[PDB]
Amino acid sequence: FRKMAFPSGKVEGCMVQVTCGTTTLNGLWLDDVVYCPRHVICTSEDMLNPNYEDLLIRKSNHNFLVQAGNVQLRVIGHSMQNCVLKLKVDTANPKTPKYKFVRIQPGQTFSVLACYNGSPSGVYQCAMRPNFTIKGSFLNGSCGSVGFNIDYDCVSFCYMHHMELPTGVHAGTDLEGNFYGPFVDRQTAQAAGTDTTITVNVLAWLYAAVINGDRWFLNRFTTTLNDFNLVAMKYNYEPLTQDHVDILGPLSAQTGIAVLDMCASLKELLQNGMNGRTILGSALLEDEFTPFDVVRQCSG
Amino acid sequence: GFRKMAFPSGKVEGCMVQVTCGTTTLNGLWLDDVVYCPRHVICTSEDMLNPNYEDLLIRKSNHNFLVQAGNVQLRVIGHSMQNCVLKLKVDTANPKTPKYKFVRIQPGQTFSVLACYNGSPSGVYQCAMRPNFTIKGSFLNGSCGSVGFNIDYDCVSFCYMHHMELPTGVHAGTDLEGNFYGPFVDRQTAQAAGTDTTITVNVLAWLYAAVINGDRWFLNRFTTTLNDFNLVAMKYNYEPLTQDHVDILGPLSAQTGIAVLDMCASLKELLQNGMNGRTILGSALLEDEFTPFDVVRQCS
Numbered sequence A: 001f002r003k004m005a006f007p008s009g010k011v012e013g014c015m016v017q018v019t020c021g022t023t024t025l026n027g028l029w030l031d032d033v034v035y036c037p038r039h040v041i042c043t044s045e046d047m048l049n050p051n052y053e054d055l056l057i058r059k060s061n062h063n064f065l066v067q068a069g070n071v072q073l074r075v076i077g078h079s080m081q082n083c084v085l086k087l088k089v090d091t092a093n094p095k096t097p098k099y100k101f102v103r104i105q106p107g108q109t110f111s112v113l114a115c116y117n118g119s120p121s122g123v124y125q126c127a128m129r130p131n132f133t134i135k136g137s138f139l140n141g142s143c144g145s146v147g148f149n150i151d152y153d154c155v156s157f158c159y160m161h162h163m164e165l166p167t168g169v170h171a172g173t174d175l176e177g178n179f180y181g182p183f184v185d186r187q188t189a190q191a192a193g194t195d196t197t198i199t200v201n202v203l204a205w206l207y208a209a210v211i212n213g214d215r216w217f218l219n220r221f222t223t224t225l226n227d228f229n230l231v232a233m234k235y236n237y238e239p240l241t242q243d244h245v246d247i248l249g250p251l252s253a254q255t256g257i258a259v260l261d262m263c264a265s266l267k268e269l270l271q272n273g274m275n276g277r278t279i280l281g282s283a284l285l286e287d288e289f290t291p292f293d294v295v296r297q298c299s300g
Numbered sequence B: 001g002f003r004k005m006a007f008p009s010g011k012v013e014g015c016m017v018q019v020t021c022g023t024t025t026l027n028g029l030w031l032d033d034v035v036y037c038p039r040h041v042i043c044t045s046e047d048m049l050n051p052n053y054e055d056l057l058i059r060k061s062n063h064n065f066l067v068q069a070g071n072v073q074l075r076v077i078g079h080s081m082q083n084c085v086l087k088l089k090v091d092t093a094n095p096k097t098p099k100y101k102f103v104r105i106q107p108g109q110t111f112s113v114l115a116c117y118n119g120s121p122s123g124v125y126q127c128a129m130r131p132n133f134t135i136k137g138s139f140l141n142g143s144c145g146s147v148g149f150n151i152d153y154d155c156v157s158f159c160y161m162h163h164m165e166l167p168t169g170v171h172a173g174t175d176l177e178g179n180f181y182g183p184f185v186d187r188q189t190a191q192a193a194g195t196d197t198t199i200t201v202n203v204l205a206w207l208y209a210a211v212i213n214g215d216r217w218f219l220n221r222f223t224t225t226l227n228d229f230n231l232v233a234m235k236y237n238y239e240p241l242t243q244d245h246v247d248i249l250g251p252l253s254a255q256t257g258i259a260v261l262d263m264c265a266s267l268k269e270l271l272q273n274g275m276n277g278r279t280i281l282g283s284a285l286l287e288d289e290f291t292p293f294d295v296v297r298q299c300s
């Protein structure tokens, strides 16, 4: 059982380079529009309190250099939607996949295609943290990298990368340019709210460890949902809802371990620790596999 | 702060096809006008328990092989066997063939796996070749012929093709010349992996990573010979170092100014003395699936 990203080819064919001034980041080219973070228009000065409408009205199409590979794309118009800039170009991307823009919920996972200068460099799986950060790997120049899920032939874009926080986690927007979380695209050190652990995902993973013949942490006991949640919140774990219990059904049927029985195992682990032992390779409880993720990878 | 990060998979996605013999379907790799796949596609279940591949192959003709990209049949105009891979000459050169080569990697090296079923990619993830020549993959029925690769500049270096799952649930396969990694054979018989050891060169890369990040409590004032370190390491189930290992730690040694053999002395002390309750990069466990290349690629 492995942390698996979606194949990235459909997204790679959409990545381009966007330059304004001495700022270069990545853009997402879909049909005849390139989406990118609007802070590409900010100067060293601007970035502390950028009045974006005011800065954007002063820009001309020819101030934006867009390159796909060796070719430059002519910008013929631009608009702003929240924190994303939309550069209209004179050419349609023939590699545009079937796609939609979605806003994901905390606890949900997605694949990130990390890009630099419009060129893809790596792909990995991340989750929207309960505090709306993402624990990514992003360096200078990664802005405009996107996160996505694939269903059949449809790419659902859910994330565009904008910034790193002082703690080393990351923040960004959906493809409508609305941030996840209380963050703002100005050059300031911003802290997130307190993070918590995605409890339904930890349970999915424990079930995964059992499908793979790992069951040392199981115990003969059970718990009510509310008593489990009391203990969870004590340990800064998210509460488990009845929908979460329902979502865990398939994994429960598969292994014949009731959801609330696994909650009793997880309660024991929180109270007792792992005592040196490890689970599916990990010394820590893992919370960035969803129920769907576990199944998709025990399915094909 | 480190993630397993795969290479973008699009260039390899554009090479994946399916190969069927009778009812047995696995994946093939289409490069120029050749399709490469595991030779056991020619085996019925009865042949698998104990196959005569040379005789099974003589009985076959080009018209027994169904090669498809999607649902589009690719006509086979020739066939041959190289070690445990079948090479199917086809009448169409793959228009999406990237620049590529076939390399045989050493234990400890990491690579990206594009897991595929019926010629369609399902996921990409990073694997390390263990010293016992197995990988901890996530592979189901129908995954054979999925490949492992690295990308350098625009060149895809193919290093792995998947063939089997061992009793303990780890995975084995060949290079793209059909030579198995390790002592395994493509027969449905009882086979076991050697006892595995820790990848010393990668632990050292991880210690260099910790130093780059300012986490350097474990550095000591002493040094060692390569021979004395190797003899100590084997007593802790660590792999001895090779000269090539010393060389691929070169860039990280230069980046930090810590000679390789001084780092070895620091690792020797950790082995002999333990962590004493402390952590490195946030963990009490030493990581051994990040190569020196992985470290630089995520730090720089």
Ligand SMILES: *[C@H](O)[C@H](C[C@@H]1CCNC1=O)NC(=O)[C@H](CC(C)C)NC(=O)OC[C@H]1CCC(=O)N1CC1CCCCC1
Pocket: A025, A039, A042, A047, A138, A139, A140, A141, A142, A143, A144, A162, A163, A164, A165, A166, A170, A184, A185, A186, A187, A188, A189, A190
């Ligand atoms: C876009 O490519 C870029 C990606 C960042 C760079 C390093 N890692 C990333 O993910 N994004 C930015 O540069 C944003 C631009 C703003 C106008 C939104 N800023 C940003 O990420 O910042 C850098 C981080 C580093 C940690 C931190 O504190 N900080 C904020 C500022 C102010 C406080 C002092 C440090 C610099």
